[PDB]
Amino acid sequence: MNTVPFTSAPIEVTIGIDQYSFNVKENQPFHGIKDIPIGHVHVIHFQHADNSSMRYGYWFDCRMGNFYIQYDPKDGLYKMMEERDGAKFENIVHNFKERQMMVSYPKIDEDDTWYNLTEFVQMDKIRKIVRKDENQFSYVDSSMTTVQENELSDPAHSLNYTVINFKSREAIRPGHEMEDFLDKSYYLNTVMLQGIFKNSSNYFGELQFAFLNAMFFGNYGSSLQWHAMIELICSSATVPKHMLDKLDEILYYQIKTLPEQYSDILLNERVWNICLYSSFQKNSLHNTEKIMENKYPELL
Amino acid sequence: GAMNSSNYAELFNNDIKLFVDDTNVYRVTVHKTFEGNVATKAINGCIFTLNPKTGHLFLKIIHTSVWAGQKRLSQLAKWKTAEEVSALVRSLPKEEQPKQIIVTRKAMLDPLEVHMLDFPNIAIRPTELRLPFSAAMSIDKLSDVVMKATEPQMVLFNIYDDWLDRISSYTAFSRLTLLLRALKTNEESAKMILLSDPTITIKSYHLWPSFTDEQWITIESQMRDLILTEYGRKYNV
Numbered sequence: 001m002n003t004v005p006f007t008s009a010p011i012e013v014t015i016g017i018d019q020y021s022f023n024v025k026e027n028q029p030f031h032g033i034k035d036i037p038i039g040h041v042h043v044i045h046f047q048h049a050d051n052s053s054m055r056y057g058y059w060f061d062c063r064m065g066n067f068y069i070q071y072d073p074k075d076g077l078y079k080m081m082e083e084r085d086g087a088k089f090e091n092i093v094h095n096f097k098e099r100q101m102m103v104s105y106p107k108i109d110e111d112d113t114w115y116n117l118t119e120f121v122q123m124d125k126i127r128k129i130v131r132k133d134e135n136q137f138s139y140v141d142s143s144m145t146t147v148q149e150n151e152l153s154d155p156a157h158s159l160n161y162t163v164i165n166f167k168s169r170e171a172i173r174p175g176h177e178m179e180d181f182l183d184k185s186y187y188l189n190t191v192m193l194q195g196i197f198k199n200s201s202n203y204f205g206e207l208q209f210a211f212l213n214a215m216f217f218g219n220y221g222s223s224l225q226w227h228a229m230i231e232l233i234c235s236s237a238t239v240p241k242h243m244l245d246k247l248d249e250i251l252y253y254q255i256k257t258l259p260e261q262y263s264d265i266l267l268n269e270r271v272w273n274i275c276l277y278s279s280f281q282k283n284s285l286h287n288t289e290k291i292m293e294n295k296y297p298e299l300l
Numbered sequence: 301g302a303m304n305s306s307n308y309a310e311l312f313n314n315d316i317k318l319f320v321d322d323t324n325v326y327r328v329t330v331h332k333t334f335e336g337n338v339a340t341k342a343i344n345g346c347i348f349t350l351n352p353k354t355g356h357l358f359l360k361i362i363h364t365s366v367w368a369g370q371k372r373l374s375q376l377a378k379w380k381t382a383e384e385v386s387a388l389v390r391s392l393p394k395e396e397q398p399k400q401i402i403v404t405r406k407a408m409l410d411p412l413e414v415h416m417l418d419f420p421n422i423a424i425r426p427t428e429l430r431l432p433f434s435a436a437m438s439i440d441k442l443s444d445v446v447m448k449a450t451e452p453q454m455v456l457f458n459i460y461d462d463w464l465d466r467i468s469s470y471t472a473f474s475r476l477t478l479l480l481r482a483l484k485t486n487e488e489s490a491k492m493i494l495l496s497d498p499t500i501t502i503k504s505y506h507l508w509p510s511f512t513d514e515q516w517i518t519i520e521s522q523m524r525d526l527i528l529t530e531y532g533r534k535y536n537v
């Protein structure tokens with residue numbers, strides 16, 4: 001079990017760790033989060049009490065280094081940093097543990113929620129969507145725009161998700177216009193799965209990362225990406241059976257985890273009604289359709 | 301964006317544009333079968349593709365053989381329309397290709413956009429106008445060439461005859477849409493108006509009769525009256 005320590009907490013802030021969150025008061029005796037499960041990516045995120053504008057945070061994997069948080073009073077935010085001196089880091093964290101100044105990652109043992117939300121998410125893929133190669137961790141916030149959004153403005157701060165556009169030459173084979181527009185299997189299976197992603201695991205990983213950025217930061221371009229990747233599968237008549245079964249599990253846990261009060265802004269009525277009731281895969285998402293109908297029957 | 305009453309004069313500026321009407325592409329008669337079920341029989345159709353500035357009409361005849369063995373024909377008809385319009389554009393010299401294509405029905409937007417991906421600079425637009433181009437098959441010479449076709453065929457006509465020698469495009473389009481609206485509302489009466497005076501003939505190379513300026517005013521008044529009549533006969537007013 002790993003630890004992301006904090007040098008201090010000088011400003012009042014709500015801190016998230018994965019699906020958990022807690023309030024820290026201004027200058028409260030706070031030194032961090034311990035007992036973080038090894039084996040998964042994680043996200044530590046922030047919303048300042050004085051400006052709820054800009055949720056921001058950091059994707060990381062404690063297997064890749066020793067990371068800590070330190071507030072920067074010039075840039076006005078909590079920054080993740082790597083400590084390269086392993087002995088120094090271990091000794092400081094051990095003292096914090098002895099003085100019980102760290103919250104414990106509060107994982108219930110029955111609970112597989114975070115595994116289920118991050119099953120295909122890899123740090124190495126995160127770091128190619130979020131380009132900042134001098135760090136091992138990745139910063140995301142509410143305002144960052146996607147490559148696709150920019151095309152329709154600072155490229156160093158973009159989310160480089162894979163561009164999906166159903167009315168593009170990439171999506172539509174010359175001479176197969178009607179076929180390819182009404183059945184997107186060639187775009188899904190040849191262009192995207194064989195061509196760009198290489199396998200369904202990397203496709204699902206980007207889908208899961210897009211949802212999580214939409215949920216945790218309200219990142220609108222991420223929400224657009226998540227829905228596009230769902231729609232591309234559901235609008236394909238020919239999908240490997242193992243992908244459909246896994247998609248149903250992925251979406252089920254995403255819908256389960258969404259705050260009930262954010263459903264109005266994070267769920268696209270058109271996409272979901274099309275996917276569950278009109279698409280080729282209308283009958284292939286039984287768990288997702290059941291949880292959507294019991295939890296958000298209004299949207300449908 | 302959408303073409304409507306506010307930007308109506310844009311139709312007659314010097315940027316090449318085409319209206320595309322797909323109403324008459326997939327045409328059927330509905331009949332009873334020996335067992336007492338219902339079936340359809342297709343008949344020849346046509347794409348109505350019109351330059352409103354010049355009157356140039358590209359009438360692509362759709363032969364019933366294109367439907368043979370196909371399913372979901374009303375959906376296919378929109379994609380076949382888009383395929384044929386895209387083929388027409390590619391067949392034109394660059395300086396004759398349109399800068400905008402206006403579709404009379406919104407369901408043509410996605411089929412045409414997808415077929416025109418190679419032409420990103422050609423704008424595909426809907427319209428809020430209720431244009432009467434479905435009545436094109438009430439023009440006898442157009443209906444005749446469609447029904448006689450034994451294979452796919454493109455036939456090129458000026459729908460304004462020689463009117464542009466004497467009137468502007470705006471006025472010519474207004475005459476055309478009044479004639480077609482009349483033929484759509486009461487074809488029998490409209491055709492009676494147009495031919496009641498046998499001494500006014502249709503030239504071999506024309507579609508409409510050879511009315512003088514003064515006769516067109518009378519004709520146009522008679523068509524307005526017809527339209528208002530039918531509107532009363534319909535709504536009782």
Ligand SMILES: O=C(Cn1cccn1)NC1CCCCC1
Pocket residue numbers: 005006007068083088089092093
């Ligand atoms: O304080 C530092 C790095 N530093 C900045 C100025 C001088 N040393 N690092 C600690 C070790 C790990 C836990 C909290 C962060």
